[PDB]
Amino acid sequence: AGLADALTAPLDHKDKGLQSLTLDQSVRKNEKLKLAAQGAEKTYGNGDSLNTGKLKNDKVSRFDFIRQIEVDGQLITLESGEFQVYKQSHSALTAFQTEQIQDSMVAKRQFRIGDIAGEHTSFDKLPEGGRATYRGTAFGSDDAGGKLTYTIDFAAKQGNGKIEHLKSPELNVDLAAADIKPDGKRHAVISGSVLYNQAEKGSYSLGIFGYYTKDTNNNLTLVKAQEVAGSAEVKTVNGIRHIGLAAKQL
């Protein structure tokens, strides 16, 4: 699988798919995150990069995470459980399957999406026309068999999707059509509603990822938006549930 190689071996530029994954939302500047798998364990801080080049693409790589916090002196364990990483060619996202937390150790189960990084497509460099259909995996708590189909129209700067084959019937939802907008860093992002049986059930956000090229005289020539990756919050009878979304072109 290459998990221990992803935790131990340094970054190699000849690896496939996404190579480096900057950990920012998964590890805050005051805390530390321990990852263990296949007999290896490494301690990552804030800003540290995860070597995803050794991981398999379009699959869920699972680790054992322990979230500690640095309070003046030694570290205090706040959380522990499973740490999921979904890798694509130009983007990757992380997920936290919380099993144990700190007493206020008490057993509590959660599922929260962590970092979502990659090669962001600038909103100012988007293609000005054409339809693009992205297909991929949508995965929730204890279920990675979700299928995502999200279409983007660049002429109208809109996009609508659909999630299928999830174990929870309330999570197979349709992603309402939403406009393409820039964020603070002017990345191409999409924020829309989540509908189930013609009922507004939640929200979803997808980031656009792809490569680009320049000519000999620093002029933009080629731009592609090949992947999308984000998350969704769906309301269920048992409470709010989060779902990780990733999709690419064929």
Short mmCIF file of C-alpha atoms in Angstrom, two decimals:
data_model
loop_
_atom_site.label_atom_id
_atom_site.label_comp_id
_atom_site.label_asym_id
_atom_site.label_seq_id
_atom_site.Cartn_x
_atom_site.Cartn_y
_atom_site.Cartn_z
CA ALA A 1 0.00 0.00 0.00
CA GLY A 2 2.84 2.36 0.87
CA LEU A 3 1.53 3.97 4.06
CA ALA A 4 4.78 3.55 6.01
CA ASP A 5 6.59 4.83 2.92
CA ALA A 6 4.27 7.85 2.96
CA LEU A 7 5.11 8.51 6.62
CA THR A 8 8.87 7.82 6.51
CA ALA A 9 10.32 8.24 3.01
CA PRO A 10 10.97 11.83 1.87
CA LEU A 11 9.18 13.48 -1.02
CA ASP A 12 10.29 12.26 -4.46
CA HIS A 13 9.48 14.32 -7.55
CA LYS A 14 9.06 11.18 -9.69
CA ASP A 15 5.98 9.92 -7.83
CA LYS A 16 2.48 9.80 -9.29
CA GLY A 17 -0.61 11.91 -8.57
CA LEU A 18 -0.48 14.58 -5.90
CA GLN A 19 2.89 14.56 -4.13
CA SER A 20 2.75 17.01 -1.20
CA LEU A 21 -0.28 17.70 1.02
CA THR A 22 0.06 20.75 3.27
CA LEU A 23 -1.58 20.13 6.65
CA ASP A 24 -3.20 23.38 7.78
CA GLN A 25 -6.79 22.73 8.93
CA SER A 26 -5.94 19.25 10.23
CA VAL A 27 -3.23 20.53 12.62
CA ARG A 28 -3.53 23.96 14.21
CA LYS A 29 -0.42 25.92 15.15
CA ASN A 30 -0.85 25.16 18.86
CA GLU A 31 -1.43 21.40 18.52
CA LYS A 32 0.28 18.33 17.06
CA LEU A 33 -1.05 15.33 15.15
CA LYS A 34 0.42 11.82 15.31
CA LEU A 35 -0.12 9.42 12.39
CA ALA A 36 0.60 5.69 12.55
CA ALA A 37 0.19 2.86 10.03
CA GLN A 38 2.09 -0.24 8.86
CA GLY A 39 4.44 -0.11 11.84
CA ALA A 40 5.37 3.56 11.33
CA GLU A 41 4.43 6.74 13.20
CA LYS A 42 5.29 10.38 12.55
CA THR A 43 4.40 13.60 14.36
CA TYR A 44 3.16 16.42 12.12
CA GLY A 45 2.68 20.03 13.18
CA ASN A 46 1.08 22.97 11.42
CA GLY A 47 2.23 23.66 7.87
CA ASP A 48 4.05 20.33 7.65
CA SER A 49 3.58 18.44 4.40
CA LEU A 50 2.30 14.87 4.07
CA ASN A 51 3.98 12.75 1.38
CA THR A 52 0.96 11.55 -0.58
CA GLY A 53 3.10 10.62 -3.58
CA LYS A 54 3.58 7.17 -2.05
CA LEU A 55 -0.19 6.68 -1.62
CA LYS A 56 -2.54 5.15 -4.18
CA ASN A 57 -4.70 7.44 -6.30
CA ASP A 58 -8.50 7.46 -6.17
CA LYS A 59 -8.49 5.33 -3.00
CA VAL A 60 -8.95 5.97 0.72
CA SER A 61 -5.70 5.55 2.65
CA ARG A 62 -6.43 4.99 6.34
CA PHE A 63 -4.20 5.87 9.30
CA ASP A 64 -4.41 6.02 13.09
CA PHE A 65 -4.38 9.63 14.27
CA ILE A 66 -3.86 11.08 17.74
CA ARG A 67 -4.54 14.81 18.16
CA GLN A 68 -2.51 16.27 21.03
CA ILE A 69 -2.26 19.90 22.12
CA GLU A 70 0.81 21.82 23.31
CA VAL A 71 -0.05 23.65 26.53
CA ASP A 72 3.13 25.39 27.73
CA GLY A 73 4.87 22.13 28.62
CA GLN A 74 4.15 18.58 27.52
CA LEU A 75 1.43 17.46 25.12
CA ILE A 76 -2.09 16.44 26.15
CA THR A 77 -4.05 14.02 23.97
CA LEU A 78 -7.30 15.63 22.81
CA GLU A 79 -8.46 13.08 20.23
CA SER A 80 -7.67 9.76 18.58
CA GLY A 81 -9.12 7.56 15.86
CA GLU A 82 -8.84 6.95 12.12
CA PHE A 83 -7.38 9.48 9.65
CA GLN A 84 -8.53 9.08 6.04
CA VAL A 85 -6.75 10.54 3.00
CA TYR A 86 -8.24 10.56 -0.51
CA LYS A 87 -5.69 11.28 -3.25
CA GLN A 88 -6.19 12.46 -6.83
CA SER A 89 -3.84 13.75 -9.53
CA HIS A 90 -4.20 17.47 -8.74
CA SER A 91 -5.99 17.54 -5.36
CA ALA A 92 -6.32 15.62 -2.11
CA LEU A 93 -8.39 15.84 1.06
CA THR A 94 -8.23 14.44 4.58
CA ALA A 95 -10.91 13.16 6.94
CA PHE A 96 -11.04 12.49 10.68
CA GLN A 97 -13.01 9.53 12.04
CA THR A 98 -13.05 10.37 15.74
CA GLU A 99 -13.23 7.33 18.02
CA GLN A 100 -11.81 8.57 21.34
CA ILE A 101 -11.69 12.07 22.84
CA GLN A 102 -10.55 13.71 26.07
CA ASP A 103 -12.52 13.54 29.31
CA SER A 104 -14.17 16.73 30.55
CA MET A 105 -10.58 9.38 27.65
CA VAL A 106 -14.26 9.04 26.71
CA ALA A 107 -15.53 7.18 23.64
CA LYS A 108 -17.31 9.45 21.15
CA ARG A 109 -17.60 8.88 17.40
CA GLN A 110 -17.41 11.74 14.89
CA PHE A 111 -16.53 12.34 11.24
CA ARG A 112 -15.09 15.72 10.22
CA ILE A 113 -13.39 16.69 6.96
CA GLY A 114 -9.87 18.06 7.42
CA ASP A 115 -7.64 19.75 4.85
CA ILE A 116 -8.63 20.01 1.19
CA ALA A 117 -5.57 21.07 -0.81
CA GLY A 118 -4.09 20.78 -4.28
CA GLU A 119 -3.44 22.94 -7.32
CA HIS A 120 -6.27 25.46 -7.12
CA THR A 121 -7.64 26.84 -10.37
CA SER A 122 -7.62 30.63 -10.29
CA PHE A 123 -11.07 32.14 -10.77
CA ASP A 124 -9.53 34.66 -13.18
CA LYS A 125 -8.07 31.87 -15.36
CA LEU A 126 -11.17 29.67 -15.69
CA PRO A 127 -12.18 28.35 -19.12
CA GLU A 128 -14.78 30.63 -20.68
CA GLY A 129 -16.93 27.86 -22.19
CA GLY A 130 -17.69 24.19 -22.41
CA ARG A 131 -19.32 21.57 -20.19
CA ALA A 132 -17.23 19.27 -18.00
CA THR A 133 -18.54 16.20 -16.18
CA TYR A 134 -16.55 15.00 -13.16
CA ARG A 135 -17.04 11.58 -11.57
CA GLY A 136 -15.47 10.26 -8.40
CA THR A 137 -15.91 9.08 -4.82
CA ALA A 138 -18.13 10.49 -2.08
CA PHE A 139 -17.30 8.98 1.31
CA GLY A 140 -18.84 9.39 4.74
CA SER A 141 -18.51 7.78 8.16
CA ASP A 142 -17.69 4.06 7.79
CA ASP A 143 -18.75 4.21 4.12
CA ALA A 144 -16.40 4.93 1.20
CA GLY A 145 -18.63 3.49 -1.53
CA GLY A 146 -20.25 6.77 -2.51
CA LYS A 147 -20.26 7.80 -6.17
CA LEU A 148 -20.22 11.49 -7.11
CA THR A 149 -21.27 12.94 -10.48
CA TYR A 150 -20.91 16.73 -10.72
CA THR A 151 -21.27 18.70 -13.96
CA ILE A 152 -19.90 22.22 -14.49
CA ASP A 153 -21.04 24.66 -17.19
CA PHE A 154 -18.35 27.31 -17.61
CA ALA A 155 -20.44 29.48 -19.94
CA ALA A 156 -22.97 30.11 -17.16
CA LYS A 157 -20.44 29.39 -14.37
CA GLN A 158 -22.77 26.89 -12.68
CA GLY A 159 -22.66 23.26 -11.60
CA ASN A 160 -24.97 20.52 -10.34
CA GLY A 161 -24.25 17.04 -9.04
CA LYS A 162 -25.64 13.82 -7.62
CA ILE A 163 -24.45 11.34 -4.97
CA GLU A 164 -25.31 7.65 -5.18
CA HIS A 165 -24.65 4.24 -3.63
CA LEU A 166 -24.26 5.43 -0.03
CA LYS A 167 -25.31 3.09 2.77
CA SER A 168 -27.39 5.79 4.47
CA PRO A 169 -30.44 6.47 2.25
CA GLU A 170 -30.72 10.06 3.51
CA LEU A 171 -27.23 10.86 2.17
CA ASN A 172 -27.85 10.04 -1.52
CA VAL A 173 -28.68 13.64 -2.37
CA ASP A 174 -28.63 16.00 -5.35
CA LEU A 175 -26.23 18.95 -5.25
CA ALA A 176 -28.26 22.03 -6.17
CA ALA A 177 -26.99 24.21 -9.00
CA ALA A 178 -24.65 26.87 -7.63
CA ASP A 179 -22.58 29.64 -9.18
CA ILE A 180 -18.79 29.62 -9.48
CA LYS A 181 -17.33 32.31 -7.24
CA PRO A 182 -13.86 33.30 -6.01
CA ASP A 183 -12.80 32.98 -2.40
CA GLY A 184 -10.34 35.09 -0.41
CA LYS A 185 -7.33 33.81 -2.36
CA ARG A 186 -9.33 34.00 -5.63
CA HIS A 187 -9.58 30.24 -6.08
CA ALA A 188 -12.49 28.83 -8.06
CA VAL A 189 -14.97 27.64 -5.42
CA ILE A 190 -18.65 26.68 -5.48
CA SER A 191 -21.09 26.92 -2.57
CA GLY A 192 -24.58 25.50 -2.95
CA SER A 193 -27.49 23.74 -1.29
CA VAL A 194 -28.07 20.02 -0.76
CA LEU A 195 -31.51 18.71 -1.76
CA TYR A 196 -33.12 15.34 -1.01
CA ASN A 197 -36.57 14.41 -2.38
CA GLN A 198 -37.14 18.04 -3.44
CA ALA A 199 -36.35 19.13 0.14
CA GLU A 200 -33.52 21.46 1.15
CA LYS A 201 -31.39 19.24 3.41
CA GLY A 202 -27.95 20.84 3.58
CA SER A 203 -25.01 22.55 1.90
CA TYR A 204 -22.00 21.61 -0.21
CA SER A 205 -18.77 23.31 -1.26
CA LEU A 206 -16.44 22.21 -4.06
CA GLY A 207 -13.04 23.56 -5.04
CA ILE A 208 -11.82 23.49 -8.63
CA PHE A 209 -8.35 22.05 -9.30
CA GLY A 210 -6.26 21.72 -12.44
CA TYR A 211 -3.01 22.57 -14.18
CA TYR A 212 -1.94 25.44 -16.41
CA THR A 213 0.96 26.39 -18.68
CA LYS A 214 2.66 29.57 -19.87
CA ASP A 215 4.33 30.31 -23.19
CA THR A 216 7.89 31.56 -23.71
CA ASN A 217 6.97 35.17 -22.83
CA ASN A 218 4.99 34.77 -19.57
CA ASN A 219 1.59 34.69 -21.27
CA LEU A 220 -1.19 32.30 -20.29
CA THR A 221 -1.78 29.69 -22.99
CA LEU A 222 -3.24 26.47 -21.52
CA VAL A 223 -5.65 26.03 -18.60
CA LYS A 224 -7.57 22.92 -17.59
CA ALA A 225 -9.92 22.31 -14.65
CA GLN A 226 -9.60 18.55 -14.33
CA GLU A 227 -10.71 17.86 -10.74
CA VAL A 228 -13.10 19.07 -8.04
CA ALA A 229 -12.92 18.33 -4.32
CA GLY A 230 -15.02 19.48 -1.39
CA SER A 231 -17.46 18.51 1.34
CA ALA A 232 -21.15 18.52 2.17
CA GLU A 233 -23.36 18.76 5.26
CA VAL A 234 -26.64 16.84 5.08
CA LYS A 235 -29.38 16.91 7.71
CA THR A 236 -30.62 13.47 8.78
CA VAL A 237 -33.07 12.21 11.39
CA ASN A 238 -30.03 11.29 13.51
CA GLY A 239 -28.41 14.73 13.17
CA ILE A 240 -26.04 16.49 10.79
CA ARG A 241 -23.66 14.29 8.79
CA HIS A 242 -20.60 15.30 6.77
CA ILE A 243 -19.56 13.77 3.43
CA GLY A 244 -16.26 14.13 1.58
CA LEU A 245 -16.49 14.69 -2.17
CA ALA A 246 -13.87 14.13 -4.87
CA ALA A 247 -14.24 13.84 -8.63
CA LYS A 248 -12.17 14.03 -11.80
CA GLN A 249 -12.51 13.72 -15.57
CA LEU A 250 -12.04 10.53 -17.56
#
